Design a protein around this ligand. Sequence first.
Ligand SMILES: CCCCCCCCCCCCCCCC
Ligand SMILES: CCCCCCCCCCCC
Lengths: 372, 372, 427, 399
Amino acid sequence: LIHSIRLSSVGPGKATGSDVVHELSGMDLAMKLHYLKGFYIFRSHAVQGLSVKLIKESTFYLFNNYYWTCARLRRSDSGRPYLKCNDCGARFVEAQCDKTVDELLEMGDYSSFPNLLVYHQPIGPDLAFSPPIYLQVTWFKCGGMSLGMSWAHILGDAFSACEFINKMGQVLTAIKANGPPDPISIKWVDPVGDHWVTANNSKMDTFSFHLTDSRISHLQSNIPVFESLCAIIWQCVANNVTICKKGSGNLSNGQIISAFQADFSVMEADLEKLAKVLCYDERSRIEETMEKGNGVADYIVYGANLTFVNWEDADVYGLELNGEKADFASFSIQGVGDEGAVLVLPGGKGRILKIILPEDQILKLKTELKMN
Amino acid sequence: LIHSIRLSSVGPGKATGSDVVHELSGMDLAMKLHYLKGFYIFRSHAVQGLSVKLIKESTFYLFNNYYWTCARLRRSDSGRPYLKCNDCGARFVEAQCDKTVDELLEMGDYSSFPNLLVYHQPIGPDLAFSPPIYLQVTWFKCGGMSLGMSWAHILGDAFSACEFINKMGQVLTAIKANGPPKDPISIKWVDPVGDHWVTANNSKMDTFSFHLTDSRISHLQSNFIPVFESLCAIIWQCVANNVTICKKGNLSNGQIISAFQADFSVMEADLEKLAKVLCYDERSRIEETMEKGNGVADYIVYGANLTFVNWEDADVYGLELNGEKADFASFSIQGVGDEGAVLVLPGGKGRILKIILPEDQILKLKTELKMN
Amino acid sequence: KYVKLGYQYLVNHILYLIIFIATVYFMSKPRHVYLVDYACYKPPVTCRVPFATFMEHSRLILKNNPKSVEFQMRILERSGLGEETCLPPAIHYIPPTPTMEAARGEAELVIFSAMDSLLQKTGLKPKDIDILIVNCSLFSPTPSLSAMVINKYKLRSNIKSFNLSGMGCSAGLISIDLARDLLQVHPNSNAVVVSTEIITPNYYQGNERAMLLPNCLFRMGGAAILLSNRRRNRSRAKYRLVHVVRTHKGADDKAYRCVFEEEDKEGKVGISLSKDLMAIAGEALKSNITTIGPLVLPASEQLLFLMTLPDFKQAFEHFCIHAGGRAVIDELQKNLQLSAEQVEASRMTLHRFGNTSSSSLWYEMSYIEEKGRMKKGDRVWQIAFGSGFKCNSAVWKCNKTIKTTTDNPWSDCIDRYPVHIPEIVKL
Amino acid sequence: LIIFIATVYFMSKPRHVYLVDYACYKPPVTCRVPFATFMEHSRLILKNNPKSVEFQMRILERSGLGEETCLPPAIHYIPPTPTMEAARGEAELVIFSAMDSLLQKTGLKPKDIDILIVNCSLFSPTPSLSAMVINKYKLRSNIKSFNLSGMGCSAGLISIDLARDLLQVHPNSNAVVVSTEIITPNYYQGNERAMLLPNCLFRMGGAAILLSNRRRNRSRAKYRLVHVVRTHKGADDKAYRCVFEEEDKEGKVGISLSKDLMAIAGEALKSNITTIGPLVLPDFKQAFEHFCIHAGGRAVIDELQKNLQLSAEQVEASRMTLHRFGNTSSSSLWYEMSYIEEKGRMKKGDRVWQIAFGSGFKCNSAVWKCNKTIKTTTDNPWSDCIDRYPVHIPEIVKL
Ligand SMILES: CCCCCCCCCCCCCCCC
Ligand SMILES: CCCCCCCCCCCC
C-alpha cells in the first residue's frame, strides 16, 4: 500500500544557543506514555504547486517558534526528565501510495489510516535519540497529498498539536505568497524505564462511527450533547470514570482532567442518573503526586478509568493548503490503558465517536449497538 | 569447493587476416560430438612467481601458432561446417579453491576433478558463438595451482591437445627467460543434433578409474608390446561383439581407428584368443562416408561400440612450470556413447584405466574385476 | 633549499637615451593583477546540520559499527565547528543516496548563486569575461563545470576555459596563479575563478574510520572571484595580487599517500587519511613559509636571519589560514606566535561554515572585511594545503579601504561572531 | 629613431614555442580486442537486451576500426568489474610508459621540468594524475602542475594552448603535456543504446609531449607552434547537451549522445575553420601540407573530407589512426602525427593542421610548422605495422 519510504530530519533554521533547556511539568510527565496521531488528506487541487522542498522549508521556518519540539530528552541528577534543546530536529518521512485519494476515501474501513499515513515510533528505549515529532508526507497517484503527525504528549495536548499543524500551514502559505520570513484520573503502572510505552494486558482495538444531528437529538430524549453521549456509551459499556475536556500559539497540556468514583450499580441505572453524575480539575493533585516522586514514577492518564475525551473544540480541520481545508482529517490517541477510552471529534452536523477497548469488548459493544 | 569464478577471453596476439578459414576433414566432422578434458595440478613450489597475467600473456603468444583454435564454426552453402578464423578467442576462467593441493591429492578418488577443475561447455546450440577451447586456472590456499582444458575434438586428438599444453608451458618458460618473443564399422549414425553438438545417451554414463600397477599386469598376462592389448582383452571379457580400437598414429586427428566385428562368444573365450583377435585403419572409409553426407550427417566415434583408447604413449606429464612436472595430470573424454569406452593412460611403470559405462554396468564391473 | 628558492625568485623580482631607458623598463614590467571583487555562497538555513543531528544520523546509519560512530563523535567534538554549518540536501536523508542528478543540482545552486552575486556586485557583463577557471576537486561531469557556466551565462565562443579537478583544497590558489599568468599574457582582459567543492559525491558511504573524517568536517561553500588587468579596474579594485608561491611535496612517498582516494574493504570509495598526516602538513607548511619568507620579510629580519646562519607577523597585517582543521590553526599560531586576533578570521570561519575546501580563504577574507579591519595598503597572507600535499600561498595588498556591505555571507551573524569556541563540545 | 622602432618590436615579439618531441603509448597485444570478440562479449553481457547487442553490432560494423585496437585488462572479463585499483593501474601503465619514452628520447632530466599539464576527461583521483607523475619522477616542489579534467576529447589542444601561454610567461622553461583517457572507468555498464556508443569506439592510448621555449631547442625541435584556435559552443543549449554524462533508468552512469550530435559537430567545425581561415590563408586545403583530424568518428572524417574537398591521401593519417588504434580521445592527434612522420612525409617547412572536438562541444585546432625534416625511427607506435598500413577499409565489416 505504501512504498518508497525515505527518512530525513527537519528542525529550526536558527540555532537556539547552548545551555537552553525546557522543563516538563507534572502534567507533561503524567502524559509521557501517550502519543497523538493526526492525519490530513487533501486532493490534488489543494496541493497544487507544493513539493517536498516547500514543505521542508516551511517546517524549517516553523520550528523556530517551536524549537523545544525538536529537543531531546535528558534526565537530571534527581532523575526527572527534561528537554535539552540541541536542535536535533523532528523526523521527516516521504512516502508514495499507488492508490488515489478518491479510491482511498472510498473504502469505509478508515481504521488502517492512522497506521499507514502516520509514522510513529515511541520515545525510548534510549531517550537521548528519540525525536518527539514524526511528520509524514504521502503522495498519491491523482496528485493528492496526506500529512500525518505523530506527536509526543509531553509536548502538549491535542489542541496544541492542531495549533502546531495550523501554524505549519500558515507558514507554508506565507512563504509561497511573500517569500521566506490523591488523584484518581491517573493510575500507577510498573516502571517502564526509558521505554515510554503504555503496557496493555489485552490487544486494544479501535472502532469509530459517525453520528448525525438527528441521531444525537433522538438520543437526547432524556454542552449537554457531549454529556449525553458520554452517558450513553458509559451505560452500554456497563465504576471509576475520567473526563478530559478543553482548558482555558503556546504549546501546553492545558486540558481539564476530572474523575468520579461511583459506588453504585452503573449496570442498572437511569440515564439521567449518569448524566447528572457526569455533569455534576485534578491538575493540582497530579502535579503534587508527580512532584513527590521527583518525576521518576510512571503514570497513565488515558485508559486509566474509561477516559472520555472532548475534542469537538479541536481545530482538526484548521490546516488549509492554498486556502482549502483537508478532504479528510482525523486524530487519535496512540497508547491507551486496559480500561480504554472514548473520543468525540467534530464531524459535520454531528460528531465522530472513536472507541478503544479490548477486542472482545469491541465485539460486545458492536452487538449492543446493533439495535440501539 | 570452487568459488570466485571469473570469465575472460584470450586469443592470438597477431591478427590472422581477413578471409582466412580452416577446413574440417572427415575425421574432424566424425569427432565433433566429443570433447577432451585434461587437467594438471602443481604444488606451490612449481608455480612460484606465476600470476594470471603471465599465463594470459603466454596464451596470447601461443595462439599465434594455433590461431584456428580461436576460430568460430560456420556452415558453407552445402552445410559442411568449417572454422572461420576471426580470432574470437578461447575462454579463460579464474577460480579459487579453499582446499590445498595436499588435501585434494589425499582425498581418495579423483572422480570429481574433471568436473570442477575443467570448465566445459559444448559447442552450440549457436555455433557462431561457441569457443572450442576453455582454459581454467585454479588457485589453492597453499599456493599450488591447477590448469584444466576443455578441448573440442574437431581441433584434434588427445596427443594434439597434450602437444598444445606442452607448447603453452614452453612459451611461458621462454617468456620468463628472455621476455616476449564399404560402410565403416567404427562409427555409428546418430539422430541429427543440428547446431548443438552433444552426444545423446539414453542412460547415466559414469566413470571408474584405477591404477593397475606394473605387477598385476604380468599377473593377469600369465593367465594365458601387447600390454594394452591384453588389458583390453581382459576388460572385454569382463564386460561380456563389436569392438573399436583407437591408438596413436600442427594439430590433427591422427589417431588410427579400427574396428573388429566378432561372432565367437566373448564370455567363453580364452584371454589369448581375444588378445589375438584384438592385435590381429579406417580413415579412408570414414572420410568417404562423411563426404557422401556432405559433412551434414552426424556420427559418434567413442561409444559407438566397445571402445578401447591407447593413450599410454600420450605426453600427459609434458607440461613443466619452472622445470617441474605436474604433481597430478589426467585426461578423459566427455561425450562417450552408450556402449562405453576404456582409456589407458600412463602411470609410469603402470597404467591408469578409466572405464566409462552405464552406472549399473559400472557397479557390476566393480565386483567382476576384483575376482582377478 | 627553500631559502634558496625564495632568494632565486627574489633575484628576478626586485628588478621590478631617456626613451631607451624608459622603454626597456615599461615594456618588461609585469602587468598588475587586481582582485576586482568576489562573491561567497551563503548556504540556506534549510541545509544546516547541528552536532546532535549529525550524531543521531551517524547512529542510525552505522548501526552495526559502534566504533565508527564513537570515532565520528570524537572527531566532531574537537573539530571547532558550530551549529550553522550546512550540508547539501541529498545528505540529509537517513541513508544518504548520492546521485549525479543531486550532485549537478548542488553544483548548479552553489556556482550559479556565486556567479549571480559576482555579476550583480561588479556590474560585469558575461560578454566581457575572457578567462574562466573552475576548480572542484571531486565532482567532474563530462561537460565541464566551466562548460556549465558558459552555457548558463552565454559566454563568448573564444572563452579561455579551464577545469581543474583532483587538486585538493589548495587548488583555489592554483586557479589564482593560473589566472595571474593568463592575465600576464592577455592584456585588457577579465578572468573569473570559481572555487568550490560539491559535497554530494564527496560523501563516503562506508564505515572505515580512516575515511570518515571528511564526512565530519567538509561542508557547503563556494566562491567566485573577478580578476583583471584593465586600467579602469585599477581604482575600484579591492586588492592587488602581490605574490603566489606553490609547494608540491608529491616527490616524497609519504606526502603523496597522506590523502588518498581509494576503495575500502567493501568496495566503497573514499578519502583515506594517513596517521602521519600532521607531520606531512607541518613539513609542507614550513617549506612554503621558508620559500615565501625572502619575498615578504623586511630587510632587517632577512639580515638578522642571515647573520645567525624570522617574525612573519611584521610582514603581514592579515592572515587567512585554510580552515582544513583546528589542529593546523593551533600549530600555525603556536609556531608563528600569532595572536588570538590574527587567527580570529580562520577560527570563526571554521566555526561558522566548517571546512569549505577551496573557498574557505574567501570566507576568511569576507570576515576580515566585514569587521571593517581591511584598510588601504594592508598586506594579506592566505595559505592553503591539500592532497598530493600541495601547499600554496598568496600575498595580496589592499587597494582601497573596504566599506562593510550587506551582500556577504557574514551579514546576518557578524555582529556576534567573535564567539568563544570551547575545546570540547558536549553532546 | 632606430631604437624606438627596433626594440619595440624586439620586446613585443612572442616567445617561440617548440615541440621538442613526443611519445605515444603502444598498447600491448594482450589488450587486443577483435570485432568478433567484442560482439561475443556483448552477447554474453547484454543477454537480456537483444536490441542493445544489435545496436552495438550496427555501430561497430561501420566504425572504421580494425582488428588491433586495445582495451584495458579490466574490460576483458565477460562481465567487466571496474574498480579504482584497476583504473589506477591502467593510468600508471599508460602514463608512465609514455613519460619513460619521452624522457628517454629527449634526454630530459626530471629536474628540468618546470610545467606539467595532464588532461584526462573522466578519470580524476583525489591526488591528481599530475601529482602521480610528480611522485613517480620526483619533480621539483615549485613545479607548475595542472590537472584538466572533464573537458573532453578536444582538451589535448587546450593543454597545448595553456602550455603556450605559460611558456610566454616563463622564459627558459620546459612544459610536459600528458594527454590520455583511462578506459576502465569510462566503460558503461548498462544497456541504454544512447550510452553504448562510447564503449564501441574508445580504445587505449596516451601521449606525452615536451614543449619548450629554450634557445637550445631551437634547432633539434620537431615543430614550432604557429597557432591555436579555440571555439566553444556551450552557449547553445543543443550543443551543450549533445554529449552529456548522466545516469540511466538503472542508476548506472554513462555518456548519452544526442541524435543531432553530428549536426552540432558540423557547425562547431565550421566555426573553427572560419576563425582560422584569416590566420593561415594568403581554399583551405592549400594552406597546409598535412591534416590531423581527431579520430572521433568515421562520419566526421567523411564530412570534413567532403566539405574541405580533401583527397584520400590528405585524410589518410586520420583514417589509418582510426583503423589501427580506434578512438583514443585527446591523444588521437599524436598518433596521426606519428603516422605522417613514419611514412617519411614530414619535411622541413611543412604546415600541419590538427583539429579536435568533444564534450560541451569545444572545438579546437592547432597549426604547427615543421622545424626539421623528420627521419623514420623504430621507437614509435607505428613501427611494427607502418610497412602495410595504408590499407583498404571496407564500408561495412562483415562478422
Ligand atoms: C536543525 C535540524 C537539521 C535537519 C537536517 C539534518 C541533516 C543531517 C545531515 C546528515 C548527517 C550525516 C551524519 C553522518 C552519517 C555517517
Ligand atoms: C583475442 C581475444 C582477446 C580478449 C578480448 C577481450 C574483449 C573485451 C572487450 C569486449 C567488450 C564488450
